[model samples]
Target: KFPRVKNWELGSITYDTLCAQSQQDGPCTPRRCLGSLVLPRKPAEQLLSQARDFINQYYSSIKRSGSQAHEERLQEVEAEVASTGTYHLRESELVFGAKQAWRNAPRCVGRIQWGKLQVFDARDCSSAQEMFTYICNHIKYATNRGNLRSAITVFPQRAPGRGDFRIWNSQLVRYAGYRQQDGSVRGDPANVEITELCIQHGWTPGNGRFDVLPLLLQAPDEAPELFVLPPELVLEVPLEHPTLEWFAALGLRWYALPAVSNMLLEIGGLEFSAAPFSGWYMSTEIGTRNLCDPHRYNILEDVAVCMDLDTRTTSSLWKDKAAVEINLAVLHSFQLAKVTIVDHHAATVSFMKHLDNEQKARGGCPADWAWIVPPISGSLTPVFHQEMVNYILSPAFRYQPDPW
Candidate 1:
């Protein structure tokens, strides 16, 4: 059995608390609609409608006339939704990330011993379509034979599509150095080494592989699954260090990978190759609570250990607000290392806020926490000074396909 990282019951902090946190913490690039009369469940109609909607939405891009491939793909997913009424993916189980998420707890299929659900190094829209189809087919055939049933779901990353080190460094852990006691960004350049060490890259303390990932990326979404950062992403690494123990610290007994991470891996064919940016590091989260009163913990304080470089000499790193601490570090790291922000969580949040701050912008967080969204600029930390050099390469960083 795996250790419970955080309470994941219907309204646990990781999910419910996260929902509340979004108001103040914000990654609300997207929003939701509620209060209005929500559509009541019409299972059969819903399945057909959703299937049609998916096809209609992407038909222009995936267009192919007289192609059995298209027909077969639609049939596969549609069959799944129709038969199951509904399917779910759990943190314990993945539709997009981590193998441990697939413990034999009967996600959709009932108790069996080995290989519940998953696709091999698959890629492409067709491959994804085929993958889901097989899941459904298995479910249908098994149900008919009454052997047992397994719920099927793929781990989709909570990102724009692309897994591997690129997203992890640039996307998750916006580049940054250690935070100082004062609120000023320490004056130093961010180094790729900092984050590389953070995530325990091949050169890090573990097995010590120095295969630097491909420099400058184009569309991580375009890469294939042949490049998944296995030993790191999977539970296959050997040795120790801040990076090596990162996921293990969370007690992720089953896979349970980050949402954005898995999404890119599946759709982007993104190899977890290397990057030239020395400051790139991935952002991840972990939490745990006693079976009793869970509200007594300070999530920010607890998680700060990873962000603080000189924890032994430093006073408690912002024991109350972790997001504030991390955002500062990520930004400072980027400025120090002079790396471009291909993708980063805080950058993503800030960018969303930047546009929202513009007149008549797209959706933003509901009126509860404006400060949380724009984020307090006053929050820049002292670690910014600790950076070795200022990279300042934002202007040269080119973005394509992404309208933003």
Candidate 2:
């Protein structure tokens, strides 16, 4: 049976036949649907089947399915796996797979621009120093002096008997979080452990609310080596409100690129453990989640007090008012700094369009409604009312354990 997806706003309906292609089951049962969970609590096709399927998909994408070239490539992969116990993806195949991974990502709302991603194949990287060079190049290329571009730099694949090439940071650029004397956090609370690890590994810790952390690049069987990013290469936007001039005095800032460095990229049964991918930030990601989340910066009450909002009762909607202004500040600041960013409304609208495009092209779009819908204005966004099917599809980006 196929799931009937519906759009409440438009009253359109589509059967998710594409989800039938999902080879894995998610955390769902006949009695309960755990579709709202952020991360699924977790597939070698015996490898030839995956390789053949991916090859078939690639060939079909280029209108060359079942052709001589396709068959030859399948045979080539089979030969390599038969001999080496693993296989390599051709350059074009790697590129195609990377784009497909982004397209198949359920949490991304910017899938409308999936086809435009730039892929950098770092398969030949041999050392931590070399990995640093490649990552720097990626950051510079993707930053583009504030006109951010979506890109991914893939390191070597996981080998049969060798350890993986891994980036230990959750993201390419993140602020250091120093655990304070009063049992509080000074910077991004999410990164306190990583920050502490950096210090233990010889990084001179900085005392600030937005100190950038260094890279922990690990080559197979070697201890992770620390490499500091060039200050000029990391572009940051200082937040400011369009009308609230005092907002600038709060000294809030965020990086321009949201490059996730910890996720694994799986293609044709091969895994690249250090494939860092990035895209421009959505305003609500910074404003609502990063800045206002209780476990994050938790700046809502501060901003509320700055704006003279009464914190006496929840009925006053002080938190809501403060969060809106924060989002507005993020948009206004990014725009003023010429940094690429999209507001929640614009992003969700684009996602609705992406859903429509995928429905026509693939007969379904895999989406997690909890993630697709904007955090601040849930019901206000079109994605909130749209029913979706959540499933895993590879080539895919997957969460991997920390290399600590």
Candidate 3:
């Protein structure tokens, strides 16, 4: 057996020899490397050591006798490693790894559909321009005219002695943030840094409340390239309350999908540093978290006033009341637009089912309580009462460093 290492968290265990080796070479910060499974310089040797584990893992998971084909592939990996000092996974292995990564994502409450994720292999991309092309195709395919599908497009892996491939934007769809001279942000506060980066690279900053940010993609060994998203390709929803016709006058809107671009996808000992994945929005993500959070839009007070709530008194629960109303408007608007969206109530119910299913299938689920629970209403969902454990799993989706 290959020796296993552990990451301590709520009594959880994760075999992470991959991370241990990388940490020793440098004072690696979690922000830069936590989610990444960086390969060692001698990948062929490493894979050889991890071979029995992988072969046994594959056979056990597939529930079949080891075939000559499996042995042949192993021999092929060995041969390639001996000759070239590195190896790549087969197409089948990559697909299985991608799906498992989504299933193992702790912050996602949408794991019920994890098995249905569409995996796009872009591992053959050789440059930033081609990476940009792949991202555009991923956006178009995942957006799907508001009927979004969960999809992950994995790019080339990080190689030893080379910079990693990376997507500079936090997500495929994001609003630009322009920091004004008076210290106020004109758009999405979360995107201020990337927005400034875009500006420095010669993209014009729009004064609008919801200008989509351009993507900065870096292929291995190349300077990063900036590419603006085509306006027509970006599916957007104009926010409106069902009964509050005046709410439409607020000019609020959001992208139809949330495609995270900066996460690392770790499979075995390999890291896909630029795997962009997307899913339909859980209304709370757009409503309570993004639109109402203090650091985000900070619109609760504005919305409370629009609803004519008693904002003057703390005892009035004006913020709480306004938050629910905003959430309702978000759900109602998305439904009216026929956009794929899930309300917190429905999402949490699904998550509870997912937990139970995972328990039967895999002993337990890894979850983050703060993330799984909706921002507006925590105690109401069944998940609020349920106990959970968080742990790391290989073939996982992980947060990674900013491309800059």
Candidate 4:
């Protein structure tokens, strides 16, 4: 084998090599560098050497831009970077979900609810479809989703080497309603209530393109209609203990996986509830630990979700402990819990910094944290790998960003 390198001795040769390799005397003879599989991993090391400078420059640019308009100046940039990364990650998670849905295997999760599809009124365009069209407009501005159809793909192949189902499905949602033969709604067979999921740049099938299809199925769970006013936010299908019981944590208990467990806890799973963290995220879905998921990447949670806003400061359900009653977010084995927000952001800034601080003191985060059962990964074997690829790779939570 080639010479082995020691971690501790790494810095010893770095300075000497740099000095000796310096160009002088008309640059001597310039030579191109090529690498082979047997070569030491130096190019990456060198590239990373300048990473701090790059980060410093990025920060300098942000700082030098100087307090422009508080609300709008850097809103888009900030949203695109941290916010967009989060958005994209969740979008990718949607892709993983579509793929996983194709595979029929029972799984372990956090708040496991049985899949249910009851007859929901297609007449209520005021609810799902109305929300659909409204979000579509914002998404058009966000991802230029209006042009995805008949347009070449915007991102390149394999930023992280996965086909983007979010781009596909969001594009599907971009134009989800059924068209009549004459393009008139009056002649349609069935009025549609659409639920569209979009991912920015994330997972995909092997090779390049993925011909994503709509995951249109009636919800499997049926509960009585309950509505509250001023805009209704009601809980139906009430449960006494947990909204639904999950065996995933118990299943994964044998592997005792670290990264996956960290990710589970990162997303606010009950297993690692006792694990220490650098900092805790507001919602397991929206928090720092959960953002990298290729799916289930939600930015908003809790009663603020009822307000129908996607702000960083919007209330989350996970942070709260008082409102323990839960709602199932989907027909799948998933449920929503109320949470409080401490380390999170709302869509726009407000006059008060702590929009709900004392409420946080008495409760915890806010009114919007939803505790869904984590993705059912109990059956998968965990090898305790670093970077926890599976946690970020699958549709565990939802959404991932395209690095490209």
Specify the highest-lDDT model's number.
Answer: 2
Clashes of each: 62, 0, 0, 73
Record all residue pairs in model 3 with backbone atoms less than 3 Å apart, i.e. clashing: none
Quote each prediction's TM-score: 0.25, 0.98, 0.87, 0.15
**Model 2 spans > 4 angstroms off:** 43-45
In model 1, where is the ten-residue run with the lowest total lDDT?
Answer: 387-396
Q: Each prediction's Cα lDDT score?
A: 0.28, 0.93, 0.80, 0.21
Candidate 3 lDDT tens digits, 1-404: 22332322233333323222221132235576432234322346666655444555565567754778767777877787688766788777888888887887778999999889888899999988889888889888887887888888989988879999999888898999888899999999998999999888888888988999988888877778889888999988899998887788889999898899888987766788999999899999999989998999889999889889999899999999888888888999899899999998899999988976876677567776767878777888877766555556666776675766
Instruction: Assess candidate 1 and give its lDDT.
Output: 0.28
Residue 108, model 4: lDDT of: 19
Cα-lDDT of candidate 2? 0.93
lDDT of 1 by residue, 1-404 (tens): 11121221222211111112121121222375332222222245654554444343233334563367656656665676567553322232122222212211111111111134333222221332343343334334323332222333332222323332232333211222332457322211232334344434333322212222211222334432212132332211111123334523532111112212211221111112221111112222211111001231233444456555334433653443344443334334333334322223453344333323421321211221221212233223221111111011100111112111
Q: Tens digits of per-residue lDDT for model 2 on 282-365? A: 999999999999989999999999999999999999999999999999999999999999998999999988988998899998
Q: Give the distance in Å from residue 120's predicted Cα in candidate 4 to where it truly belongs.
A: 2.9
User: Quick one: best TM-score, which candidate?
Assistant: 2
